[PDB]
Symmetry: C2
Subunit: 147 residues, 2 copies
Amino acid sequence: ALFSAQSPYINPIIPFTGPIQGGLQEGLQVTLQGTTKSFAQRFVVNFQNSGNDIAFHFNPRFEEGGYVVCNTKQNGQWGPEERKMQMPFQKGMPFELCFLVQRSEFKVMVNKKFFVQYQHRVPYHLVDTIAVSGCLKLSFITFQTQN
Amino acid sequence: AQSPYINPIIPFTGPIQGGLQEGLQVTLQGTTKSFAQRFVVNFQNSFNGNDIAFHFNPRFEEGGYVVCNTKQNGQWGPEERKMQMPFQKGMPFELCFLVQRSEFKVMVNKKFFVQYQHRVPYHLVDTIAVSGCLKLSFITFQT
């Protein structure tokens, strides 16, 4: 059972950028509730420091049959991409998107089902910002702890 | 752990004595063919033949990348692609699979390359299959 870590962001204007109080922490659950636009090609969820360094870049693309890119950006440089070759979102449809911060990875769920993992390439502690952009809208983003 | 296969002839299929278990390292020392398009390391279960628990498949195409996947009931699941090629063609390699509780851990030339979380129980694997553009001097097993 989860408790809120910080007041949520409600109906935030895309492109959105906002602090995560105290930074990412083990057991933090970040939930995004929103709708993929009807003719969406891409969107982006970034966990960054304060766009130059992105610890975790989550980038669904409705291209080439539909797939999702996980990656990290350091000093302006993209690392090797990890692509999960399936599209768990649907243009025009609402979705629930959850990021669980674990010790060794982000676990990602889409609509209450496991979708991908992404092992930390830089520590999650240095993240104090979530940025969201691209072809979607959001009802909310929540922050929840088990503690 | 069990005794090595030595210059196994590719395409190859051999038993893994006792099957997979936690802490097992399976090592492949080999050489990528000079004009290598693709190769395949499959972990399979001889009791449902053509299924593959873990398919590891470097592809020298589109910049070089590696496919990890699973085949069940004759059906491929969603591919996990690492968009990076850690094998140079014509060059030797040390390919290393570490069986862990919740994943395969893959080391290439002594560097961590990828993990692949188990989708079917790892205990089902009693077979290693190697095919495509390479030759192999060894497959070892230790604990």
